Amino acid sequence: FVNQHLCGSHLVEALYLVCGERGFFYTPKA
Amino acid sequence: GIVEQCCTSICSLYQLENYCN
Ligand code: NA
């Protein structure tokens, strides 16, 4: 699920699943 | 940033994990 174009909620979902209990930062403007 | 690497080009686990805390 990671090796494709991921945008918007699809990208947040991938971060959520991969990062697990670490959590993540979603900084689209950086 | 993440949009350029994973939305307008193809994402990778290596890259995604750079955004985990
Ligand atoms: Na999870």
Residue numbers in the entry:
A (entry chain B): 1 to 30
B (entry chain A): 1 to 21
List sentences quoted exactly from the publication behind this structure.
Here, we present a novel polymer-based support and an associated deposition method, with the aim of providing ultralow-background conditions for serial data collection. The supports themselves consist of a thin 2–3 µm thick cyclic olefin co­polymer (COC) membrane perforated with a dense array of 2–3 µm sized holes and suspended on a rigid frame. These proteins included the insulin, thaumatin and HEWL that were used in initial tests, and also TD1, a tubulin–DARPin D1 complex, EcR2a, a class Ia ribo­nucleotide reductase radical-generating subunit, rhodopsin–miniGo and PepTst, a bacterial peptide transporter.
Fig. 3 illustrates the positive impact of the addition of a cryoprotectant on the loading of insulin crystals onto the chips. The number of insulin crystals that visually appear to be surrounded by solution is markedly higher in the presence of a cryoprotectant. For the insulin and thaumatin crystals, 25%(v/v) propylene glycol produced both the highest resolution diffraction (1.35 ± 0.03 and 1.76 ± 0.09 Å, respectively) and also the smallest mosaicity (0.12 ± 0.02° and 0.22 ± 0.10°, respectively). The same insulin, thaumatin and HEWL crystals were loaded into the different mounts, and diffraction data were collected and processed. We conclude that loading crystals onto the chips provides sufficiently similar levels of crystal preservation as standard mounts up to a high resolution range, allowing the low background and high loading area of the chips in serial crystallography experiments to be made use of.
